[PDB]
């Protein structure tokens, strides 16, 4: 099973540096071109560059946007792709993806598999942990619950319910900024013949503030 996991994202001050890594598995690393691609919030995909495979001597190439500012490299012993970013500006804040590129020209050519991405926020504002508030009702075969995650900076927070096993009926709302502090909420709808007899807990994660929180949704 092909797997690409991006790590190393976070809040970084303007002018700062940062090294993103991309652990891979499920395929023969050295055989592939690996590409870095980014996406600023609500913006298009931008290829930043690639590093070629063994047959090509792992030569590197870049987009003009980041050339001479960003550095790509690969640890073929561990199958890990790297990206060194220097002098980050606001324009660099984005989700960064690593993607498996070309193996054989005769085969193409495109980015076969993408990681989940890791988020970078270039900002002077300070990291702040979230307060997680359980949202219970104050009555009809189907009950809706929620979690209020109040800022908290920077993005993102991860929210799951019962460890991710509650995925259907889950709506999570994009974070809205409020004087350098984000707020988001999540909601789950389960049959009320099922709550509170079975537990509904939300799992909030804010990697930047190193916070992990489990909030059980109790009645009353």
């Amino acid at each position: 099973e092909v797997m690409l996991v991006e790590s190393g994202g976070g809040l970084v001050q303007p002018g700062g540096s940062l090294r993103l890594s991309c652990a891979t598995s499920g395929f023969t690393f050295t055989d592939y071109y690996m590409s870095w691609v980014r996406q600023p919030p609500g913006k298009a995909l931008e290829w930043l560059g690639f590093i070629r495979n063994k047959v090509k001597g792992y030569t590197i190439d870049y987009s003009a946007s980041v050339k001479g500012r960003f550095t790509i490299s690969r640890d073929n012993s561990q199958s890990i792709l790297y990206l060194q970013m220097n002098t980050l500006r606001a324009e660099d804040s984005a989700t960064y993806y690593c993607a498996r590129d070309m193996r054989r020209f005769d085969d193409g050519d495109a980015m076969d598999y993408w990681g989940q991405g890791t988020l970078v926020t270039v900002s002077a504002a300070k990291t702040t942990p979230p307060s997680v508030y359980p949202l219970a009702p104050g009555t009809n075969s189907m009950v809706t619950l929620g979690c209020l995650v109040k800022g908290y900076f920077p993005e993102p927070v991860t929210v799951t319910w019962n460890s991710g096993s509650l995925s259907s009926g889950v709506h999570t709302f994009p974070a809205v900024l409020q004087s350098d502090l984000y707020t988001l909420s999540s909601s789950v709808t389960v049959p009320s013949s099922t709550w509170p007899s079975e537990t509904v807990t939300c799992n909030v994660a804010h990697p930047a503030s190193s916070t992990k929180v489990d909030k059980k949704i109790v009645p009353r």
Binding site: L45, A110, Q116, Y133, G138, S187, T189
Partner: protein, 219 residues
């Protein structure tokens, strides 16, 4: 530095109907030797990483439904989705691989579906938030269509609009609906003075507002 332009910027189509979008290249992506065009199409569903659909302009990637089709040569390209499904909701990017790689700026595919009324839930401040002297009254408007909805917080009968934060989810991949959450934030001492907290949506599916409320003193 080949420049890639996509059109339309966005479009809305009902499930079942055919969709076609365009990719134009500032330079030819045709290799005369291989007789192939180095163009790829990608699908990025909401809240997801991109997925490959087509490479070489028209070669369908493994696993990709055959309702997706790529055509074109040189500088003019096209992606066709015969019979659109709700799952097809996404931003579609084209990308040249003729010289390094360069993405277009995407074509957003929205789904035209039937009108649908929101399911409304209201939540008093949690006791643990109240402990902090703050008070957030939260309201969920789930699975409705279209996106344009009017939510007004009536505190003790009177609209508020003070300290309100709203947030919509993208269209759903399954039922093509929207959800939104409205959060009214008060101070605790503010929250005790008033009693009636009403969240109401006036949506194009009714001239009668959909409303949920509690009375603080009944909690």
């Amino acid at each position: 530095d080949i420049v890639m332009t996509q059109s339309p910027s966005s479009l809305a189509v009902s499930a079942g109907e055919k969709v076609t979008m365009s990719c134009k290249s500032s330079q030819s992506l045709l290799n005369s030797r291989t007789r192939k065009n180095y163009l790829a199409w990608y699908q990025q569903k909401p809240g997801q990483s991109p997925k490959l659909l087509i490479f070489w302009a028209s070669t369908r990637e493994s696993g990709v439904p055959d309702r997706f089709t790529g055509s074109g040569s040189g500088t003019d390209f096209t992606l066709t989705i015969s019979s659109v499904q709700a799952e097809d909701l996404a931003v579609y990017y084209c990308k040249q691989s003729y010289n390094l790689r360069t993405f277009g700026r995407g074509t957003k595919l929205e789904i035209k579906r039937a009108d649908a009324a929101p399911t409304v839930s209201i939540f008093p401040p949690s006791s643990e938030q109240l402990t902090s002297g703050g008070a957030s009254v939260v309201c969920f408007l789930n699975n409705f269509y279209p996106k344009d909805i009017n939510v007004k917080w009536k505190i003790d009968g009177s609209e508020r609009q003070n300290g309100v934060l709203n947030s919509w989810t993208d269209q759903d991949s399954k039922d093509s609906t929207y959800s939104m959450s409205s959060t009214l934030t008060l101070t605790k001492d503010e929250y005790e003075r008033h009693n009636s907290y009403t969240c109401e949506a006036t949506h194009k599916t009714s001239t009668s507002p959909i409303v949920k409320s509690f009375n603080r003193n009944e909690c």
